[PDB]
Curated annotation (Swiss-Prot):
GO cellular component, one term: periplasmic space
Name of the molecule in the record: Metallo-beta-lactamase type 2
Organism: Bacillus cereus
Subcellular localization, as worded in the UniProt entry: Periplasm
A molecular function (GO) term: beta-lactamase activity
Entry-linked SUPFAM superfamilies: Metallo-hydrolase/oxidoreductase (SSF56281)
Pfam families named among the record's database cross-references: Lactamase_B
Main EC class the enzyme belongs to: hydrolase
Annotated residues for binding of substrate: 162, 171
Cofactor(s) this protein requires: Zn(2+)
Catalytic reactions of this protein: a beta-lactam + H2O = a substituted beta-amino acid
Task performed by this protein: Confers resistance to the different beta-lactams antibiotics (penicillin, cephalosporin and carbapenem) via the hydrolysis of the beta-lactam ring. Active on cephalosporin and penicillin.
Primary gene name: blm
Amino-acid positions noted as binding Zn(2+) 2 in the UniProt annotation, renumbered to this chain: 81, 159, 201
Protein residues bound to Zn(2+) 1: 77, 79, 140
Amino acid sequence: KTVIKNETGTISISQLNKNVWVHTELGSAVPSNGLVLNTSKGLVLVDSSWDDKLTKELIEMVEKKFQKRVTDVIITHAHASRIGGIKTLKERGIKAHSTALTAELAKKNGYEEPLGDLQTVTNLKFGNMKVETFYPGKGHTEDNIVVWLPQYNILVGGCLVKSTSAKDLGNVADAYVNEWSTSIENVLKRYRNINAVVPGHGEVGDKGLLLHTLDLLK
Ligand SMILES: [Zn+2]
Ligand SMILES: [Zn+2]
């Protein structure tokens, strides 16, 4: 349960295992989760943060702690909490992976564009760490993807998946509340044995988070 914070408390990292940490940052207090993957080829993040200021501080914190460079980031949809640090990634030579749809939504909303290199299912490998990206369909947004670590049976649900303490769906202005249930069932069908589920906001849980989200959709 190792947790490491910055001075202000606005950024922390919590270890899930030897090589996998959750990163959490507070936007102004509104927390957002992503992952830090400690691989033999460098650090890989799932999602950046709310803005360039937090993204820079997050990168500098993990580079110092883990003593390697952030080389890659997976952006799970085109909202500020996920893509807000894209300028920083691009100017530092950090590869920002996304689906084609996320990239064009980024451009549409005036953000710099991530790579658009992810397909519906993409299998990546960073050093010895295997990473699968999966587009399950529309939900929280039209473009939301989930990230699976097959060596750990860890799912990063992103904002597609609500934490136990969430009592509503959050901001639904860009959401597809009919499709969202089917998209969650697609995740449950694909990943039948889940060890941990990381929601976009709130505490890490298990498969029960996906069932909770279905309940919130009723
Ligand atoms: Zn969002
Ligand atoms: Zn969210």
